[PDB]
Design a protein around this ligand. Structure first.
Ligand code: PPC
Ligand code: PPC
Ligand code: PHT
Ligand code: PHT
Ligand code: MN
Ligand code: MN
Ligand code: MN
Ligand code: MN
Lengths: 284, 284
């Protein structure tokens, strides 16, 4: 499921999580109430409906606390599964002390990632019957980019760039510094001709100015729906190969409206910066 | 503003943030569009109203990217300031290249921490005229506990425990393993007699059972307002010294209603697990 750098990202996050929990001493309450030889069957069950993501991270949290041979998975659901309230995402058998200590860290990761995949899916359903794909941004939390990114993919969106040197994206602050969108575009092309180039426009005027330069993608920043319609109309007639991406004034209520204008992508920051946790509990 | 461990935490977070942005190559678009000698005056300004928190983290991000003597702060607001849309939280003068590279990492942190402080303050205002204090939980994001915990305090909340060995808290799964709340309570009392003890009850029945044991705090889990009122009446008559904390079915709409019952605290998970970013931009 997770790739190598995602897996490594997950391990680093679960380690930071456990360290936050354990740095003040051991789990005194678990140690005191449950014997070392105790063993139970527990299930991660959703208190609500949504799309599940990050189940492997649950397994990595246990590997860290109990060791690979410290637990047994009697059953599990697959990442990306649409799930109702009360559904058992995974049933385990493991040393009780290990589960009570690992509980919060593992639940915190799975609820966050599931919350993103559940949101992402909402957006994906909203623009169904359209050609628009939902994309994320770099408005991710430090240390969780690979995981948050993985989660939007699980819900059906498509990742944008993972970093700064990943692809070029000429922003308002660059244009300001370069003095002109076409100047900046030209500069980026000359410096990194092999790198994907996206140019951000703030108006129909700038839009007209960059279409002839034929950048890979144009990001329509904070365009009203009527302006997005015009943009697509101009792109379609003047530079059929330029992809258009809406970003800025996007809400789930307007997603379809923008998608219907014919844009190729909707870039949603909310997907990673304003996530509502999917409520999950560990039941014994 | 930030303490030593919070500072070390911020530093670790900013470093993980920058590494995510730079691991694919340098900021190609900035290097190409802005000269090394470029310098600007920039401001972090809110696109929305809210409470500000995490400004020092912005500075720490610049120290890391431009070095201490790489910039100058012409003006700044204090953490915890209630702020309107379009307010300039901090005005800097710095090398342009350094700002554009630091921008996203610093913005993502300040936005996150401010979103938390903004939400916390809404809860705090909600229970105003009551004696209840708003507290957080361990439902924090991995690697960000110290910072998230710092933010609820900036918003007016009061921190709960920071980890597992920090204070004792008997939960449902412990009760399940110990076979009883009173059993579990007795066990913890024997193991860590010097440690603060909080026990979680799911019913007025368990409440009656633990009140005589006189634990430090009792967490009323998912009680209706009427049950919360009853519990306050029983506590007041049977164990005046026992503090009560509501946690579970809390919404900002009901906050005051529960606070009015006379409980000492409201423990809010949403404060740290479902945060809506405060929208902030770097304007040059
Ligand atoms: O408002 P700006 O001057 O364009 C600065 P900003 O840091 O917002 O720039 C980015 O944010 C938007 C990302 O999706 P969302 O809006 O949902 O968060 C998009 O406008 C981006 O180029
Ligand atoms: O539903 P449970 O069986 O009590 C498991 P859970 O992990 O929810 O247990 C904790 O969550 C609540 C925290 O505040 P919030 O609800 O806002 O997130 C509270 O019930 C806690 O003891
Ligand atoms: O994070 C951003 O500012 C952003 C917002 C929208 C599209 C893409 C990006 C990006 O840089 O990849
Ligand atoms: O994270 C939790 O389950 C939690 C929830 C509410 C209060 C306190 C805690 C805690 O363990 O400190
Ligand atoms: Mn933008
Ligand atoms: Mn914006
Ligand atoms: Mn609970
Ligand atoms: Mn719950």
């Amino acid at each position: 499921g997770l790739s190598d750098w995602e897996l490594a990202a997950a391990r680093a996050a679960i380690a930071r999580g456990l360290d936050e929990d354990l740095r003040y001493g051991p789990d005194v309450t678990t140690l005191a109430t449950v014997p070392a030889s105790a063993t139970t069957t527990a299930s991660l069950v959703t208190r609500e409906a949504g799309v599940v993501a990050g189940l492997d991270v649950a397994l990595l949290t246990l590997n860290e606390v109990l060791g690979t041979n410290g637990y047994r998975v009697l059953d599990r659901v697959e990442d990306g599964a649409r799930v109702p309230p009360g559904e058992a995402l995974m049933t385990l058998e493991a040393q009780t002390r290990g589960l009570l200590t690992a509980e919060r860290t593992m639940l915190n990761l799975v609820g966050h990632l599931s919350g993103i995949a559940t949101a992402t899916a909402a957006w994906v359903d909203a623009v169904r019957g359209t050609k628009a794909k939902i994309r994320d941004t770099r408005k991710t939390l430090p240390g969780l980019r690979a995981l948050q990114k993985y989660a939007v993919r699980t819900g059906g969106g498509v990742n944008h760039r993972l970093g700064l040197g990943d692809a070029a994206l000429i922003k308002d602050n660059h244009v300001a510094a370069a003095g002109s969108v076409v100047d900046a575009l030209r500069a980026v092309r000359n410096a990194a001709p092999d790198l994907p180039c996206e140019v951000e426009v703030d108006s129909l005027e700038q839009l007209d100015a960059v279409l002839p330069e034929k950048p890979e993608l144009i990001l329509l920043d904070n365009f009203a729906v009527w302006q997005t319609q015009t943009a697509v109309q101009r792109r379609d007639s003047r530079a059929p190969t330029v992809m258009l991406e809406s970003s800025g004034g996007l809400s789930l209520q307007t997603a379809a409206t923008y998608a219907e204008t014919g844009v190729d992508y909707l870039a949603v920051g909310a997907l990673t910066h304003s996530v509502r946790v999917l409520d999950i509990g560990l039941d014994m």
